[PDB]
Design a protein around this nucleic acid. Structure first.
Length: 70
DNA sequence: AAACATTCGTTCACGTGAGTTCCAGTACAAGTCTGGTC
């Protein structure tokens, strides 16, 4: 039940962010994914266990996709 | 001088390419039903 955390449970809630759509009266929804990913590193400094940024890896072949799936 | 062969413009039938209407296959999106736990 991440849907409803229990107080006695040892595990806690974590937020893995993979997009930003607005920062300081600047609308990022019409921008490219590259620029939003770049901006996402200038909003918060992640602290493991509570808030994090999902890692994206560059790839330009099908074999890379298959290796990641495996 | 008379008979037969050849040629010519005409005619019909049959075949092939391009335009138009109708329907089947495909794609995508939304709706509906179901499963599991906490």
């Amino acid at each position: 039940d991440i849907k409803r955390m229990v107080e006695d449970s040892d595990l806690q809630t974590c937020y893995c962010v993979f997009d930003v759509l607005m920062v300081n009266n600047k609308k990022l929804g019409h921008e490219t994914l590259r620029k939003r990913y770049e901006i996402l590193s200038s909003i918060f400094t992640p602290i493991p266990g509570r808030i994090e940024i999902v890692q994206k890896t560059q790839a330009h072949t099908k074999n890379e996709v298959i290796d990641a799936l495996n």
